[PDB]
Protein backbone atom coordinates (compact mmCIF):
# COMPACT_ATOMS: atom_id res chain seq x y z
CA UNK A 1 0.00 0.00 0.00
CA UNK A 2 2.44 2.70 1.10
CA UNK A 3 5.11 3.96 -1.30
CA UNK A 4 7.95 6.48 -1.32
CA UNK A 5 6.40 8.73 -3.96
CA UNK A 6 2.83 9.46 -4.99
CA UNK A 7 -0.58 9.81 -3.23
CA UNK A 8 0.61 7.27 -0.67
CA UNK A 9 4.16 8.61 -0.73
CA UNK A 10 6.27 9.54 2.29
CA UNK A 11 4.90 13.09 2.47
CA UNK A 12 1.55 11.47 3.22
CA UNK A 13 2.68 8.68 5.54
CA UNK A 14 1.43 10.55 8.64
CA UNK A 15 -2.09 10.50 7.17
CA UNK A 16 -2.10 6.69 7.33
CA UNK A 17 0.54 6.02 10.00
CA UNK A 18 0.35 8.56 12.90
CA UNK A 19 3.82 7.82 14.27
CA UNK A 20 5.46 8.86 10.98
CA UNK A 21 4.49 12.37 12.01
CA UNK A 22 5.85 12.17 15.56
CA UNK A 23 8.97 14.03 16.71
CA UNK A 24 11.67 11.38 17.36
CA UNK A 25 11.88 9.99 13.82
CA UNK A 26 14.68 8.70 11.60
CA UNK A 27 16.72 9.24 9.54
CA UNK A 28 18.51 12.41 10.63
CA UNK A 29 21.46 14.56 9.60
CA UNK A 30 24.21 13.92 12.16
CA UNK A 31 26.11 17.19 12.56
CA UNK A 32 29.36 16.54 14.41
CA UNK A 33 29.56 20.07 15.80
CA UNK A 34 26.52 19.13 17.86
CA UNK A 35 27.20 15.54 18.95
CA UNK A 36 28.21 14.60 22.50
CA UNK A 37 31.16 12.32 23.20
CA UNK A 38 30.28 9.48 25.56
CA UNK A 39 33.40 7.70 26.90
CA UNK A 40 31.22 4.89 28.23
CA UNK A 41 29.86 3.73 24.86
CA UNK A 42 31.16 0.12 24.54
CA UNK A 43 32.56 -1.65 21.51
CA UNK A 44 29.60 -3.06 19.54
CA UNK A 45 30.97 -6.61 19.64
CA UNK A 46 29.05 -8.30 16.81
CA UNK A 47 28.85 -12.05 17.49
CA UNK A 48 28.47 -14.73 14.85
CA UNK A 49 28.78 -12.29 11.95
CA UNK A 50 31.69 -14.21 10.41
CA UNK A 51 29.51 -17.31 10.01
CA UNK A 52 25.75 -16.61 9.76
CA UNK A 53 24.63 -20.20 10.23
CA UNK A 54 25.38 -23.03 7.80
CA UNK A 55 22.07 -23.00 5.94
CA UNK A 56 21.33 -20.81 2.90
CA UNK A 57 19.96 -17.36 3.78
CA UNK A 58 16.73 -16.11 2.20
CA UNK A 59 17.00 -13.02 -0.03
CA UNK A 60 13.64 -11.36 -0.69
CA UNK A 61 12.53 -8.46 -2.89
CA UNK A 62 9.57 -7.11 -0.92
CA UNK A 63 8.90 -4.28 -3.35
CA UNK A 64 10.42 -1.62 -1.08
CA UNK A 65 13.92 -3.08 -0.73
CA UNK A 66 15.90 -6.32 -1.02
CA UNK A 67 16.03 -8.14 2.31
CA UNK A 68 18.31 -10.85 3.66
CA UNK A 69 17.03 -13.00 6.52
CA UNK A 70 19.53 -13.53 9.33
CA UNK A 71 19.71 -16.20 12.07
CA UNK A 72 19.05 -15.18 15.69
CA UNK A 73 22.35 -16.82 16.61
CA UNK A 74 23.99 -13.56 15.54
CA UNK A 75 23.79 -10.72 18.06
CA UNK A 76 25.42 -7.55 19.37
CA UNK A 77 27.20 -7.71 22.72
CA UNK A 78 27.89 -4.04 23.40
CA UNK A 79 24.35 -2.75 23.97
CA UNK A 80 22.10 -2.27 27.05
CA UNK A 81 20.22 -5.46 26.11
CA UNK A 82 21.03 -8.54 24.03
CA UNK A 83 19.96 -7.66 20.50
CA UNK A 84 19.71 -10.59 18.09
CA UNK A 85 19.88 -10.30 14.30
CA UNK A 86 16.70 -10.65 12.23
CA UNK A 87 17.49 -9.23 8.80
CA UNK A 88 19.42 -6.70 6.77
CA UNK A 89 18.32 -4.66 3.78
CA UNK A 90 19.37 -1.71 1.64
CA UNK A 91 18.31 1.81 0.66
CA UNK A 92 19.53 3.50 -2.54
CA UNK A 93 18.82 6.33 -4.97
CA UNK A 94 18.90 6.06 -8.75
CA UNK A 95 21.41 6.20 -11.60
CA UNK A 96 22.11 9.78 -12.61
CA UNK A 97 20.82 11.25 -9.35
CA UNK A 98 22.66 12.19 -6.13
CA UNK A 99 22.14 10.67 -2.69
CA UNK A 100 20.56 7.37 -1.77
CA UNK A 101 21.52 6.96 1.89
CA UNK A 102 18.99 7.67 4.62
CA UNK A 103 21.21 9.24 7.27
CA UNK A 104 23.62 12.06 6.49
CA UNK A 105 26.74 13.18 8.33
CA UNK A 106 27.39 16.92 8.29
CA UNK A 107 24.70 17.33 5.64
CA UNK A 108 26.32 14.95 3.15
CA UNK A 109 24.46 11.89 1.88
CA UNK A 110 26.12 8.93 0.18
CA UNK A 111 24.82 6.65 -2.58
CA UNK A 112 23.30 3.94 -0.38
CA UNK A 113 22.83 2.67 3.14
CA UNK A 114 22.86 -0.79 4.69
CA UNK A 115 20.67 -1.56 7.70
CA UNK A 116 21.28 -4.62 9.86
CA UNK A 117 18.18 -5.07 12.03
CA UNK A 118 18.23 -6.65 15.51
CA UNK A 119 15.67 -6.92 18.32
CA UNK A 120 15.83 -7.26 22.11
CA UNK A 121 15.52 -11.01 22.71
CA UNK A 122 15.86 -10.57 26.49
CA UNK A 123 12.53 -8.76 26.58
CA UNK A 124 10.79 -9.92 23.41
CA UNK A 125 10.26 -13.10 21.40
CA UNK A 126 9.92 -11.71 17.87
CA UNK A 127 11.07 -8.83 15.72
CA UNK A 128 7.46 -7.82 15.10
CA UNK A 129 6.65 -7.67 18.81
CA UNK A 130 9.79 -5.72 19.68
CA UNK A 131 9.22 -3.33 16.77
CA UNK A 132 6.46 -1.52 18.69
CA UNK A 133 8.38 -1.13 21.96
CA UNK A 134 10.82 1.50 23.33
CA UNK A 135 14.34 0.52 22.27
CA UNK A 136 12.82 -2.76 21.13
CA UNK A 137 15.13 -2.73 18.12
CA UNK A 138 18.78 -1.93 17.47
CA UNK A 139 19.67 -1.16 13.86
CA UNK A 140 23.17 -0.69 12.48
CA UNK A 141 23.43 1.88 9.72
CA UNK A 142 26.33 1.74 7.29
CA UNK A 143 26.58 4.55 4.73
CA UNK A 144 27.84 3.28 1.38
CA UNK A 145 29.92 5.29 -1.09
CA UNK A 146 31.73 4.39 -4.31
CA UNK A 147 35.35 3.30 -4.42
CA UNK A 148 37.72 2.20 -7.16
CA UNK A 149 37.40 -1.54 -6.49
CA UNK A 150 34.73 -4.23 -6.34
CA UNK A 151 33.65 -5.03 -2.77
CA UNK A 152 33.48 -8.83 -2.48
CA UNK A 153 31.34 -8.87 0.67
CA UNK A 154 28.61 -6.77 -0.96
CA UNK A 155 28.96 -8.81 -4.15
CA UNK A 156 27.73 -11.84 -2.16
CA UNK A 157 24.38 -10.05 -2.06
CA UNK A 158 24.45 -8.08 -5.31
CA UNK A 159 25.26 -11.13 -7.43
CA UNK A 160 21.77 -12.41 -6.58
CA UNK A 161 19.63 -9.37 -7.44
CA UNK A 162 18.91 -10.72 -10.93
CA UNK A 163 17.15 -13.67 -9.28
CA UNK A 164 14.59 -11.48 -7.48
CA UNK A 165 13.84 -8.65 -9.91
CA UNK A 166 10.08 -8.91 -9.38
CA UNK A 167 8.31 -7.99 -6.16
CA UNK A 168 7.91 -10.95 -3.78
CA UNK A 169 10.42 -13.16 -5.57
CA UNK A 170 12.96 -14.90 -3.35
CA UNK A 171 16.27 -16.71 -3.71
CA UNK A 172 19.00 -18.24 -1.54
CA UNK A 173 22.37 -16.80 -0.53
CA UNK A 174 25.14 -18.99 0.91
CA UNK A 175 26.35 -17.80 4.32
CA UNK A 176 29.27 -15.36 4.13
CA UNK A 177 31.27 -13.12 6.47
CA UNK A 178 28.85 -10.31 7.30
CA UNK A 179 31.54 -8.46 9.21
CA UNK A 180 33.04 -7.48 5.87
CA UNK A 181 29.90 -5.48 5.03
CA UNK A 182 30.83 -3.16 7.91
CA UNK A 183 33.22 -0.22 7.47
CA UNK A 184 36.63 0.27 9.03
CA UNK A 185 36.96 1.42 12.64
CA UNK A 186 33.85 -0.11 14.20
CA UNK A 187 34.83 1.75 17.36
CA UNK A 188 33.80 5.05 15.77
CA UNK A 189 30.02 5.41 15.67
CA UNK A 190 27.07 7.64 16.54
CA UNK A 191 24.22 6.55 18.82
CA UNK A 192 20.74 8.10 19.13
CA UNK A 193 17.07 7.26 19.76
CA UNK A 194 15.04 7.04 16.59
CA UNK A 195 12.43 5.16 14.60
CA UNK A 196 11.79 2.78 11.74
CA UNK A 197 12.41 4.76 8.54
CA UNK A 198 9.38 3.19 6.87
CA UNK A 199 5.74 2.91 8.00
CA UNK A 200 4.52 2.36 10.70
CA UNK A 201 7.52 4.50 11.76
CA UNK A 202 7.44 3.19 15.34
CA UNK A 203 9.87 5.04 17.62
CA UNK A 204 11.44 1.79 18.80
CA UNK A 205 14.95 1.98 17.37
CA UNK A 206 18.20 2.50 19.23
CA UNK A 207 20.26 3.64 16.22
CA UNK A 208 23.97 3.13 15.63
CA UNK A 209 25.39 4.87 12.55
CA UNK A 210 29.04 4.23 11.74
CA UNK A 211 31.34 7.20 11.20
CA UNK A 212 33.33 5.55 8.40
CA UNK A 213 31.71 4.49 5.13
CA UNK A 214 31.84 1.21 3.23
CA UNK A 215 32.77 1.28 -0.46
CA UNK A 216 31.42 -0.61 -3.47
CA UNK A 217 32.49 -0.12 -7.10
CA UNK A 218 30.67 2.19 -9.50
CA UNK A 219 29.57 -0.95 -11.36
CA UNK A 220 28.14 -2.48 -8.19
CA UNK A 221 26.28 0.76 -7.51
CA UNK A 222 24.70 0.86 -10.96
CA UNK A 223 23.59 -2.74 -10.41
CA UNK A 224 22.03 -1.94 -7.03
CA UNK A 225 20.27 1.09 -8.52
CA UNK A 226 18.60 -0.61 -11.47
CA UNK A 227 18.09 -4.36 -11.23
CA UNK A 228 15.07 -4.72 -8.94
CA UNK A 229 11.47 -3.77 -9.75
CA UNK A 230 8.84 -2.50 -7.30
CA UNK A 231 6.22 -4.32 -9.37
CA UNK A 232 5.20 -7.99 -9.34
CA UNK A 233 4.78 -8.14 -13.11
CA UNK A 234 4.64 -6.20 -16.38
CA UNK A 235 4.52 -3.33 -16.81
CA UNK A 236 7.73 -3.25 -14.76
CA UNK A 237 8.97 -0.26 -12.77
CA UNK A 238 12.48 -0.03 -11.31
CA UNK A 239 12.75 0.11 -7.52
CA UNK A 240 14.60 3.40 -7.01
CA UNK A 241 15.03 6.15 -4.42
CA UNK A 242 13.73 3.99 -1.59
CA UNK A 243 15.14 6.28 1.10
CA UNK A 244 13.21 8.47 3.51
CA UNK A 245 13.74 12.23 3.66
CA UNK A 246 15.61 13.66 6.63
CA UNK A 247 13.58 14.16 9.82
CA UNK A 248 14.08 17.00 12.37
CA UNK A 249 16.49 16.24 15.22
CA UNK A 250 13.96 17.95 17.47
CA UNK A 251 16.46 18.57 20.27
CA UNK A 252 17.48 14.93 20.69
CA UNK A 253 21.12 14.35 21.55
CA UNK A 254 23.35 12.30 19.29
CA UNK A 255 26.27 10.63 21.04
CA UNK A 256 29.69 9.79 19.63
CA UNK A 257 31.68 6.77 20.81
CA UNK A 258 34.87 8.55 19.84
CA UNK A 259 36.70 11.86 19.75
CA UNK A 260 39.83 13.05 17.97
CA UNK A 261 42.00 16.09 17.35
CA UNK A 262 40.01 18.73 15.50
CA UNK A 263 36.67 17.21 16.50
CA UNK A 264 33.76 19.66 16.36
CA UNK A 265 32.96 18.67 19.96
CA UNK A 266 35.05 18.36 23.14
CA UNK A 267 35.35 16.09 26.18
Ligand X SMILES: *[C@@H]1O[C@H](CO)[C@@H](O[C@@H]2O[C@H](CO)[C@@H](O[C@@H]3O[C@H](CO[C@H]4O[C@H](CO)[C@@H](O)[C@H](O)[C@@H]4O)[C@@H](O)[C@H](O[C@H]4O[C@H](CO)[C@@H](O)[C@H](O)[C@@H]4O)[C@@H]3O)[C@H](O)[C@H]2NC(C)=O)[C@H](O)[C@H]1NC(C)=O
Active-site annotation, residues: 64
If one asks whether residue 103 binds ligand 520 (CB under 6 A), the answer comes out as: no
- CA–CA dist 99, 52 (Å, integer): 30
Q: Which residues bind Zn ion (CB under 5 A)?
A: 115
Distance in angstroms (rounded) separating the CA atoms of residues 19 and 1: 17
Q: Which is nearer to ligand 520, 152 or 245 (CB)?
A: 245
Determine, following the binding rule CB under 6 A, whether residue 118 of this chain makes contact with ligand 520.
Answer: no
57: which strand partners?
173
Residue facing ligand 520 at closest CB distance: 128
103 is in an annotated binding site: no
Determine if 227 is a binding residue for ligand 520 (CB under 6 A): no
Q: How far is the CB of 202 from ligand 520 (least distance, A)?
A: 8
Considering beta carbons, is residue 115 or 160 the nearer one to ligand 520? 115
Pick 83 or 92: Cβ nearer ligand X: 83
Q: Out of 28, 44, 112, 117, name the contact with ligand 520 by CB under 6 A.
A: 117
The size of the interface with ligand 520 (CB under 6 A), counted in residues, is: 10
Q: Is 115 annotated as a binding residue?
A: yes
Residue 85 touches ligand 520, criterion: CB under 6 A: no
* Beta carbons of 176 and 160 less than 8 angstroms apart: no
By the rule CB under 6 A, 88 interacts with ligand 520: no
117 touches which of ligand 520, ligand X, Zn ion, none (CB within 5 to 8 A by kind)?
ligand 520
Query: What residues from 136 to 175 belong to the interface with ligand 520 (CB under 6 A)?
Result: 139
Stretch that binds ligand 520, among 29-37, 51-59, 168-176, 192-200 (CB under 6 A): 192-200
Q: Does 197 bind ligand 520 (CB under 6 A)?
A: yes
1 is in an annotated binding site: no
**Which residues of this chain interact with ligand X, rule CB under 6 A?**
191-193, 253, 255
> How many Å apart are CA 8 and CA 64, to the nearest integer?
13
Choose the contact partner of 255 out of Zn ion, ligand X, ligand 520, none; CB within 5 to 8 A by kind: ligand X
Nearer CB in complex with ligand X: 41/68: 41
State the pairing for strand pair 214-217/75-76: unpaired
User: By the 8 A CB rule, do 25 and 199 touch?
Assistant: no
Distance CA 52, CA 46 (A): 11
Query: Does residue 197 have a known ligand-binding role?
Result: yes
Site for ligand 520 in 11-70 (CB under 6 A): none
Given the rule CB under 6 A, which residues bind ligand 520? 115, 117, 127-128, 131, 139, 196-198, 200
Q: Which residues are annotated as a binding site for substrate?
A: 197-198
Amino acid sequence: HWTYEGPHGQDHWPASYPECGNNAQSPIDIQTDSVTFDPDLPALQPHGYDQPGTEPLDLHNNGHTVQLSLPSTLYLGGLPRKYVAAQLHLHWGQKGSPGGSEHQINSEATFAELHIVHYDSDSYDSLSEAAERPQGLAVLGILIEVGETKNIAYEHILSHLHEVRHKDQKTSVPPFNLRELLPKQLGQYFRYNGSLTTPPCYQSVLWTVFYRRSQISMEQLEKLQGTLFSTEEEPSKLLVQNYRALQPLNQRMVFASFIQAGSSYTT
